[PDB]
Design an enzyme around this catalytic site. Structure first.
Site, PDB file in Angstrom:
ATOM      1  N   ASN A  54       4.298 -34.792  22.199  1.00  0.00           N
ATOM      2  CA  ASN A  54       3.409 -34.369  21.072  1.00  0.00           C
ATOM      3  C   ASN A  54       2.838 -33.074  21.591  1.00  0.00           C
ATOM      4  O   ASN A  54       2.096 -33.145  22.573  1.00  0.00           O
ATOM      5  CB  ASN A  54       2.302 -35.375  20.860  1.00  0.00           C
ATOM      6  CG  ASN A  54       1.353 -34.878  19.764  1.00  0.00           C
ATOM      7  OD1 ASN A  54       0.987 -33.718  19.717  1.00  0.00           O
ATOM      8  ND2 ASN A  54       0.911 -35.695  18.874  1.00  0.00           N
ATOM      9  N   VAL A  57      -1.387 -32.763  21.763  1.00  0.00           N
ATOM     10  CA  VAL A  57      -2.212 -33.756  22.555  1.00  0.00           C
ATOM     11  C   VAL A  57      -1.791 -33.881  23.981  1.00  0.00           C
ATOM     12  O   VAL A  57      -0.583 -33.991  24.125  1.00  0.00           O
ATOM     13  CB  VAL A  57      -2.058 -35.164  21.945  1.00  0.00           C
ATOM     14  CG1 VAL A  57      -2.770 -36.275  22.736  1.00  0.00           C
ATOM     15  CG2 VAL A  57      -2.538 -35.166  20.534  1.00  0.00           C
ATOM     16  N   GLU A  62       2.915 -34.101  31.295  1.00  0.00           N
ATOM     17  CA  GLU A  62       3.025 -32.644  31.064  1.00  0.00           C
ATOM     18  C   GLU A  62       2.809 -31.787  32.315  1.00  0.00           C
ATOM     19  O   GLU A  62       1.996 -32.080  33.187  1.00  0.00           O
ATOM     20  CB  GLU A  62       1.982 -32.175  30.056  1.00  0.00           C
ATOM     21  CG  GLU A  62       2.222 -32.741  28.670  1.00  0.00           C
ATOM     22  CD  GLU A  62       1.297 -33.924  28.295  1.00  0.00           C
ATOM     23  OE1 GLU A  62       0.745 -34.582  29.143  1.00  0.00           O
ATOM     24  OE2 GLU A  62       1.106 -34.233  27.144  1.00  0.00           O
ATOM     25  N   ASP A  84      22.278 -13.304  22.921  1.00  0.00           N
ATOM     26  CA  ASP A  84      20.877 -13.770  22.704  1.00  0.00           C
ATOM     27  C   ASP A  84      20.541 -14.830  23.753  1.00  0.00           C
ATOM     28  O   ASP A  84      20.460 -15.998  23.437  1.00  0.00           O
ATOM     29  CB  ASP A  84      20.812 -14.328  21.332  1.00  0.00           C
ATOM     30  CG  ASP A  84      19.372 -14.649  20.918  1.00  0.00           C
ATOM     31  OD1 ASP A  84      18.439 -14.238  21.569  1.00  0.00           O
ATOM     32  OD2 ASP A  84      19.168 -15.317  19.929  1.00  0.00           O
ATOM     33  N   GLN A 174      13.570 -22.390  12.320  1.00  0.00           N
ATOM     34  CA  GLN A 174      12.579 -21.530  13.041  1.00  0.00           C
ATOM     35  C   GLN A 174      11.717 -22.444  13.903  1.00  0.00           C
ATOM     36  O   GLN A 174      11.301 -23.487  13.420  1.00  0.00           O
ATOM     37  CB  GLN A 174      11.701 -20.763  12.005  1.00  0.00           C
ATOM     38  CG  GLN A 174      10.766 -19.781  12.763  1.00  0.00           C
ATOM     39  CD  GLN A 174      10.061 -18.873  11.762  1.00  0.00           C
ATOM     40  OE1 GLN A 174      10.100 -19.123  10.575  1.00  0.00           O
ATOM     41  NE2 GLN A 174       9.414 -17.826  12.157  1.00  0.00           N
ATOM     42  N   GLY A 175      11.448 -22.084  15.129  1.00  0.00           N
ATOM     43  CA  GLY A 175      10.610 -22.920  16.062  1.00  0.00           C
ATOM     44  C   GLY A 175      11.538 -23.626  16.990  1.00  0.00           C
ATOM     45  O   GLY A 175      11.189 -23.935  18.117  1.00  0.00           O
ATOM     46  N   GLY A 178      15.795 -20.887  20.821  1.00  0.00           N
ATOM     47  CA  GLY A 178      15.732 -20.904  22.282  1.00  0.00           C
ATOM     48  C   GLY A 178      16.033 -22.255  22.791  1.00  0.00           C
ATOM     49  O   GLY A 178      16.307 -22.379  23.972  1.00  0.00           O
TER      50      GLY A 178
END
Ligand SMILES: CC(C)COc1cccc(-c2nc3cc(C(N)=[NH2+])c(F)cc3[nH]2)c1[O-]
Ligand SMILES: [Ca+2]
Length: 223
Positions: A54, A57, A62, A84, A174-175, A178
């Site tokens: 998420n 949060v 992480e 690219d 989009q997002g 990569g």
């Protein structure tokens, strides 16, 4: 990702979120100090977020590490998006385990019909912006060069391949840029471009990573 499903926390341990105060692109962890993403996601001030699920949060697992350098491919063309690809070195190594793991680079290119997994926190609507909080997944097949070229005549180079559904409804967006296209456990593509998202006859176009393995290896080696 449009028409995809929730991946499940940490089921995609090589996925990274590139953050500059908000999530803007995805990336793939290839070793504990390097990530591969798309050259058009380049910018300064990047913080790489590993072990995420998420993105709004902190839930545990992480690792937030700042990028030491970003190396955009020298022949990257912003107009055609040929080459690219970009390598990001991390300021310190990540601790690898099962929730954070690197993905392998390929030894051969994949064939049309190979099924792959695409993931990301990119838009989930083809008409309007709806960005999710948790990682979405999509299984998509690599298309033949003729269907890729009939869809984007004159815009596909030998460093790109199309993957997706010509009927539309399921696609990267989009997002998701990569991020990874993993087939048979090997990183084969990088989300790059497409005309809109999940539109009929307009599949996603991905950087063909098998053509850059010698470059990734030489560049990491010399840096
Ligand atoms: C902050 C920068 C990364 C801005 O980048 C972008 C801005 C607007 C759209 C995109 C984008 N649309 C995309 C659509 C598709 C597709 N149809 N499968 C894709 F594969 C990549 C895309 N990337 C995109 O990568
Ligand atoms: Ca989180």
């Amino acid at each position: 990702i449009v028409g995809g499903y929730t991946c499940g926390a940490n089921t995609v341990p090589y996925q990274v979120s590139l953050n500059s105060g908000y999530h803007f692109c995805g990336g793939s962890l290839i070793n504990s100090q390097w990530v591969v993403s798309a050259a058009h996601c380049y910018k300064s001030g990047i913080q790489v977020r590993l072990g995420e699920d998420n993105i709004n949060v902190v839930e545990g697992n992480e690792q937030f590490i700042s990028a030491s350098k970003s190396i955009v491919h020298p022949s990257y063309n912003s107009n055609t998006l040929n080459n690219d690809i970009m390598l990001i070195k991390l300021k310190s190594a990540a601790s690898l385990n099962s929730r954070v793991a690197s993905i392998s680079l390929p030894t051969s290119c994949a064939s049309a019909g190979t099924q792959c997994l695409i993931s990301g926190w990119g838009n989930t609507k083809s008409s309007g912006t709806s960005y999710p909080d948790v990682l979405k997944c999509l299984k998509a097949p690599i298309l033949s060069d003729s269907s890729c070229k009939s869809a984007y005549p004159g815009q596909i180079t030998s460093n790109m391949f199309c993957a997706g559904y010509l009927e539309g409804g399921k696609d990267s967006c989009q997002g998701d840029s990569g991020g990874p296209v993993v087939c048979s456990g090997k990183l084969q593509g990088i989300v790059s471009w497409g005309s809109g998202c999940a539109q009929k006859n307009k599949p996603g176009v991905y950087t063909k990573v098998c053509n850059y393995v010698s470059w990734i290896k030489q560049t990491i080696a010399s840096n």
